[PDB]
């Protein structure tokens, strides 16, 4: 049964609620982004209206085979009427096609559902600037002050500089980047651009990337592994055994691997600066864990909420334990006392 924090009161709507069967009273199912914990339950047999971004609807049609007649893509930054209720989709600064949803209820209440997001000051000049928000359904993934990580730009600068140095020292080194979902495409695209290579990958991952409306993508990716010196592999294969096995397959074209695992936060964050990150090495294989996050840090989250000044916060992540819930509620109250709302 669908949890309360997935239901939008005063509407027929649910958000990211496809794994509960037919939800009683639901007339429209919104999907914030194409990550499996959120789309869980969707397939070609789904026959209710799904509302989403254009990019998410490309992925629903091509990857999950949802039939076209049930996919309702909406443009961003545009007031739309859905089953009698005004809604707006906003960029969530998460993965490609990810949105936040503004609902203007018939009684005058305004609700923001962030989906998954990485808060940014640029959001302070979107259509959120223009009216009051009563209720915030908040991505609280990293809602504790220990969660610090660098900007995405500092992390990509580190990756490009590391890869370019290694391959210029050894033109027979291969770069490998791990993936298991959409998101974080800048990691492998930025490294292939500095090396003058396309990114090589499986047919299934090429198909996924072709749904993303990324400009000039036909110039950047390929299924011809032999022509590429940046390869994409499943995240599970980014270990010494998996990489040794891959190097065998390349037929002596290469004699070294430099590999990247873009994680979110790891506790090497509470001690080490990005500049000081070092790899794990075994023989001619080195593996870097780089803290590339597509969710808010604690400080980015706190700034967004103190700017928005909502009347009520409903967390959507870390809700299953009483200790997590009590921790989050304490920070919400601190933020409200410090800012004065
Ligand atoms: Ni996500």
UniProtKB/Swiss-Prot annotation:
- Summarize induction of expression: During mitosis. The mRNA encoding this protein contains an internal ribosome entry site (IRES) in its 5'-UTR. This 5'-UTR generally suppresses translation while specifically promoting expression during mitosis, when cap-dependent translation may be impaired.
Q: In which tissues is it expressed?
A: Expressed in brain, heart, kidney, liver, pancreas, placenta and skeletal muscle.
Q: Where in the cell is it found?
A: Nucleus
Which family is this protein grouped under?
Belongs to the DNA repair metallo-beta-lactamase (DRMBL) family.
What does the protein in this record do?
May be required for DNA interstrand cross-link repair. Also required for checkpoint mediated cell cycle arrest in early prophase in response to mitotic spindle poisons. Possesses beta-lactamase activity, catalyzing the hydrolysis of penicillin G and nitrocefin. Exhibits no activity towards other beta-lactam antibiotic classes including cephalosporins (cefotaxime) and carbapenems (imipenem).
| Subunit relationships | Binds constitutively to TP53BP1. Binds CDC27, which is itself a component of the anaphase promoting complex (APC). Binds PIAS1.
What name appears for this protein in its UniProt entry?
Answer: DNA cross-link repair 1A protein
| Organism of derivation | Homo sapiens (Human)
């Amino acid at each position: 049964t669908c949890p309360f924090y997935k239901k939008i009161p005063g509407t027929g709507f649910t958000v990211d609620a496809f794994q509960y069967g037919v939800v009683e009273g639901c007339t429209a199912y919104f999907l914030t982004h194409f990550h499996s914990d959120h789309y869980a339950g969707l397939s070609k047999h789904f026959t209710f209206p799904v509302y989403c971004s254009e990019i998410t609807g490309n992925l629903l049609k091509n990857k999950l085979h949802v039939q076209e007649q049930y996919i309702h893509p909406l443009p961003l930054d545009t007031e739309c009427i859905v089953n009698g209720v005004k809604v707006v989709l906003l960029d969530a600064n998460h993965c490609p096609g990810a949105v936040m949803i503004l609902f203007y209820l018939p009684n005058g209440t305004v609700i923001l559902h962030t989906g998954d997001f990485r808060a940014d000051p640029s959001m302070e000049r979107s259509l959120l600037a223009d009216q009051k928000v009563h209720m915030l359904y908040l991505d609280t993934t990293y809602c504790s002050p220990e969660y610090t990580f660098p900007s995405q730009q500092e992390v990509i600068r580190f990756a490009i500089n590391t890869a370019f140095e290694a391959v210029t020292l050894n033109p027979h080194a291969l770069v490998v980047c791990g993936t298991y979902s959409i998101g974080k495409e800048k990691v492998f695209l930025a490294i292939a651009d500095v090396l003058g290579s396309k990114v090589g990958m499986s047919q299934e991952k090429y198909k996924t990337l072709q749904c993303l409306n990324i400009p000039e993508i036909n110039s950047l990716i390929t299924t011809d592994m032999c022509s590429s010196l940046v390869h994409l592999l499943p995240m599970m294969q980014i270990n010494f055994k998996g990489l040794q096995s891959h190097l065998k397959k390349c037929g002596g074209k290469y004699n070294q691997i430099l590999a990247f695992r873009p994680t979110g936060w790891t506790h090497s964050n509470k001690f080490t600066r990005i500049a000081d990150v070092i790899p794990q090495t075994k023989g001619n294989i080195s593996i870097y864990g780089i803290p590339y996050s597509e969710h808010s840090s604690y400080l980015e989250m706190k700034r967004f909420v103190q700017w928005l000044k909502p009347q009520k916060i409903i967390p959507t992540v870390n809700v299953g334990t009483w200790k997590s819930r009590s921790t989050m509620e304490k920070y919400f109250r601190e933020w409200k006392l410090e800012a004065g709302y």
